[PDB]
Structures are given as structure tokens and as C-alpha cells.
Amino acid sequence: CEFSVSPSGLAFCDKVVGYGPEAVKGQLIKAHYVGKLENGKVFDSSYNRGKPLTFRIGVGEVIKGWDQGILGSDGIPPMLTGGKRTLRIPPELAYGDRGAGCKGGSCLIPPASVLLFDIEYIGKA
Template identity: 50%
Template sequence: MTEQTKQNIMEQFKKEDVVVGQGQEAKSGDTLAVHYAGTLADGTKFDSSYDHGEPIEFKLGAGDVIPGWDLGLLGVRVGGKRNLVIPPELAYGDRSAGPIPPNSTLYFTVELVDVK
């Protein structure tokens, strides 16, 4: 991947704090518990932890989730809510994943519930 390609990908990647949390800050290596809702560009919801009734847990920076989450959730604080726009290169790329078509930009609202 060229530097120009990396730069173009990072220009498409967006993160915005909707609510700034007051709790512990998420760092690489921390185990996070988050609630999230994910949609496609047309607004179609493809998954939501709220629908499942409990947050998911994963280790930040360990590759347990898509790269856009590992990048986008660094520095969020417990109680914070962050919107992420993740280009395909930082999500599932040219492969599909369940209801997510190949080459999809993903939109997430992620709420940090706990840092362990």
C-alpha cells in the first residue's frame, strides 16, 4: 500500500465525540465493554448490541475487531459516545460479512460502558 493510498484511507476515516465521557480513557491493551449500532451508507442497520441486550467486550488494539474500531476507540472515555465512519479498507474490504456487502463504508455509534 502506497503512502498516498494510506493517506486517502485516513481522510475517509472519521471519528466524532457525541458525548465526552468522564471516566477512564481507553488505551491499547485495555479490555473494553461497548454498546454499538452499525449501519450502512443507506442507513440500513446491520447490527446493534442494544438489540442483543448486552455490550460486547474485546481487547483494544489486539485485532479482535475491525481495524477502524481499534483506531477509532483509542482515547474514548467511559460514558463517552463516539460516531465512527470507517472506510472498507479499515473494515471488511472486498469481502462480505453477513449482511455487510463487499467494499462497504460502515457507520457506527459506539458507547464505552467499561474499561477493564
Template identity: 55%
Template sequence: MAVSTLSLVTPMPHAIQISTPKPRITPCSSSVSRCRCSLNSSPPINLKKVFNLGLGLLAASVVGFSPLDANATRIEYYATVAEPSCELEFARSGLGYCDVAVGSGEVAPLGELINVHYTARFADGTVFDSSYKRARPLTMRIGLGKVIKGLDQGILGGEGVPPMLVGGRRKLQIPPQLAYGPEPAGCFSGDCNIPANATLVYDINFVDIYKGNRK
């Protein structure tokens, strides 16, 4: 199933370095395409102009978000504060995981669409993608190889990894063999956003199960 901009707020505790804007990556399976990703080819947003016009206006323009939701999303994204640290456990596959908050809702149904917010980083903490930038969660199908293996296992569970529950927040450390492997990914016009053999760190917020699944 990010994140990508320059920080525009006063530094906060645990703030992390943020990379220069690059094309958005959908964390898709390697079977989707040779480049292993779905790219948004729109030109990068001029963040200085956005800031001058008011970040609230940008966030509030997203359909379905109240001013309060937009403000919370803006703060959460632009502050880019990492989830609290937690002690990773490791599955036999090499996936590292730990729960920041367990959640109290349903488990993710195999093969169904779910909504997640995420921030994706390299091992050094540099953000390369985030759903918070787009002010809405990512809808993805879980358990059928539509996303990288580390996200399927990290959200759906398996091999000793407990399934996530709606409302849960989990940190995942995804080794290259469960991510994009020995080839670069996120490639656009010869520039690849993710280097070969990269270990990725995802902060996952399991928002809900996509309502379109329900009859």
C-alpha cells in the same frame, strides 16, 4: 468490536429504516476467519410473538438487568433512534469521527477488554447489527487487531484521533479499507450480510473497562 429487526414502536423523530433479521456479526478483524466474522447461527427471533408476549419480559430475562435497565434498553433498541448528528472530522487513514458526548472516565487501555454498546449501519442508514438487540454490551479487546481497524483507531485513538473516554459516545464512519475491504463479510450459508467495499457507520457508547481486567 450493532444491529436487524422491524420497528415495533410508534415512529420517533430521526427514526431510521431497519433491515430484515440476519445473523449477528461480531465486528472482528479479517485475520479471524475467511468469512471475517463470528456468527450466531441461532434461528431468527419471531419478533411478532416476542411483542405479543411482552417486550419487557424479553429484556428482563437478561441476567443482571433491572426492570428499569431492561425498559431503557428496549426503548433504545426498538425505537432505533440514531445518535444526534455531529460534524465528522477525518483522520489521514480516511476514518471519520465525531463525539456526541466526550465522556469523563479513563481511556481505553491498549490490549485490554472493554465493554461497548454499538449500533452498526450502512451508509444509507440501514441497521445491520446492534448490541442493544442482545440487551447487553459487547466485550472486546482493543488495539490488537481483534476488531476491524476502524474500531481500533476510532476507540483507542491515533493519527490525530483522540482516544475515547469511558462514558463517551462517538460516531464513526469507517471506509472499506478500515472495515472488511473488497470481499463480502458476515457470510452464512451463502448469504453475506455486508457487501464488498461497504462504508460502515458505527454509533459507539463506551460503557466501561471490563472488570475482569482488574486485579
């Protein structure tokens, strides 16, 4: 997957282009996903949770990289219903130098982590 890198650093590649309409700002949608660090370590996945993630897109309910990465931004077209997209998210658009899933200074997602997600946009909820 050759990434297309947008002005902000958020990069993507559409492994499978959706067959339906583009994602819409403020809509409740469903998405399956696998999030990994750059060393291949899986830090979270819908599959591990046993259910897709149901959330509204474009209103800050998830990291900025997901809002921009799914709804689109400068240099980033929107995902389409039924699409599969890989996203490379710089820390600035994820959890920053703070990290996530922390126990003291040790975090599941280390500070300044670039995150990789394989996103399956199922469609609206």
C-alpha cells in the same frame, strides 16, 4: 455530527465526550453499539444481541476501524470512559471488498462498504 476526517479516512465525531480516563491498549472493555450502512440499514447492534460487546481493545479482536477509532490513531484522539462516538469507517479498515455476513456473493455487509457506528464506550469490563 460534523465528522473530523483523519489521514486514513477513518472519521469521527464525539457526540458526548467521556467523563473518565481514555481507553488503554490491551484492556478488556465493554461497549454498546449500533452499526449501520450508509443507507440507514442497521446490520448489527449490541442491543439486538441483548448485551454490550466485551472485548479487548487494540489487539485485533475487532475491525481495525474499531481499534483505531476507539484507542485513537493519527488524527484520532482516544474515546474516554462514558463517551459516545460516531465512527465512519472506510472499507479498508472494516471488511473490505469481501463484505461480511455472506451467503455466497450476497452479504449483510456488501463488499466495499463504508460502515457507520454509534459507539458507547462504557468502560473497562
